[PDB]
């Protein structure tokens, strides 16, 4: 675990602060009595300045003891390599984070086809994490992909994708029938519930939002990550009105890049 490193760093900072506080106390007391214009302010200022340093020393010692209660249990040229490698990944990690936000491109032009196994392995690679999510693939009609994604005991999502580009989504509850009489996937149907219709609209807005121009895998990854947050539904209240119910509906809006519950009327 890496918490011990932070605990040790905080202990070092605390002991340095304690030493600096003792030095400050003794220097400030050595300085002596000042002028402070009138007599009455001269009397109060020295005492006020003297009390604060001792209070700071006591507070630092108390927090140091609180941490003490909290804490618990050729080669050189090799290390010079290691301490360099971790210095690179972080250095680029910020630089990639600051250049993507300020995109200076104006147009893709100057002056689609994928193997089915590619899509299948990408979807499996998405499926390996998020153990609650379960994804099933089919192609009843042509090369278009139909995916059924089940979430917990709450959600069932039907996704129609056109050559790995997500195209259409319809969600339903758990007990509702998802298959047709023939046994195939039912594409054209409705959830017969207001909240599920509202979250279908939300999913349509989400798929209209996440749009990268030349990386299509990150788009479906972000969509799956956003859809992951819905498992906690009916247990979390809105961040503005406090109560769960507004006009008889529970919070059904999950903000992008900050996944917290919200009512639709609360924006």
């Amino acid at each position: 675990v890496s918490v011990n490193l932070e605990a040790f760093s905080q202990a070092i900072s605390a002991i340095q602060a304690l030493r600096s506080s003792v030095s400050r106390v003794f220097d400030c007391l050595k300085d002596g009595m000042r002028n402070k214009e009138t007599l009455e302010g001269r009397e109060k200022a020295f005492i006020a300045h003297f009390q604060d340093n001792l209070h700071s020393v006591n507070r630092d010692l108390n927090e140091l003891e609180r941490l003490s209660n909290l804490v618990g249990k050729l080669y050189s040229q090799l290390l010079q390599a290691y301490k360099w490698s971790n210095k690179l990944q972080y250095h680029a990690g910020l630089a990639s984070g600051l250049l993507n936000q300020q995109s200076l491109k104006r147009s893709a032009n100057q002056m689609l086809v994928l193997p089915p196994q590619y899509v299948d392995d990408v979807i499996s690679r998405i499926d390996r994490m998020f153990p609650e999510m379960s994804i099933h693939l089919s192609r009843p009609n042509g090369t278009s992909a139909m995916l059924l994604v089940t979430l917990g005991k709450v959600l069932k999502v039907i996704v129609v994708m056109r050559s790995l580009f997500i195209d259409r989504t319809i969600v339903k509850g758990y007990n509702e029938n998802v298959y047709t009489e023939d046994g195939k996937l039912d594409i054209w149907s409705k959830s017969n519930y207001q909240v599920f219709q509202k979250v279908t609209d939300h999913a349509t807005t989400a798929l209209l939002h996440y749009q990268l121009p030349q990386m299509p895998d990150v788009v479906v990854r972000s969509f799956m990550t956003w859809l992951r947050s819905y498992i906690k539904l009916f247990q979390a209240p809105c961040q503005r009105c406090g109560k769960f119910l507004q006009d008889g509906l529970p919070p059904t809006w999950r903000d992008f890049r900050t996944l917290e519950a919200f009512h639709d009327t609360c924006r």
Partner: protein, 106 residues
């Protein structure tokens, strides 16, 4: 009577070993250079304006003051020494020493 002699090296080294045993606290130089006699030059007239004037110790009685002194003091014109105006200890003080500076300083 008229020695004209130089100290031997033994004295030099034994005083060299002295600071290894005795610390030298400090010293203060009294003749603070502030007079205009050492600043004026011949055929060089000086034009001075009002209020421009282009480790504080009590030099009479060896008393240390703070970083910024509290009580007002008096400054000698010629030597430039600074001394406290009203002495703190009067009921118990050397009256043979304090009475020698009431009128003027040397």
């Amino acid at each position: 009577e008229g020695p004209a002699s130089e100290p031997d090296e033994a004295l030099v080294d034994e005083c060299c070993l002295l600071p290894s045993q005795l610390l030298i606290p400090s010293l203060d130089w009294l003749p603070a250079s502030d007079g205009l006699v050492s600043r004026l030059q011949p055929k060089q007239p000086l034009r001075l304006q009002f209020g421009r004037a282009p480790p504080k110790i009590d030099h009479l009685r060896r008393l240390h003051l703070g970083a910024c002194p509290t009580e007002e003091c008096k400054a000698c014109t010629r030597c430039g020494c600074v001394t406290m105006l009203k002495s703190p200890n009067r009921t118990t003080a050397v009256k043979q020493w304090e009475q020698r500076w009431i009128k003027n300083c040397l």
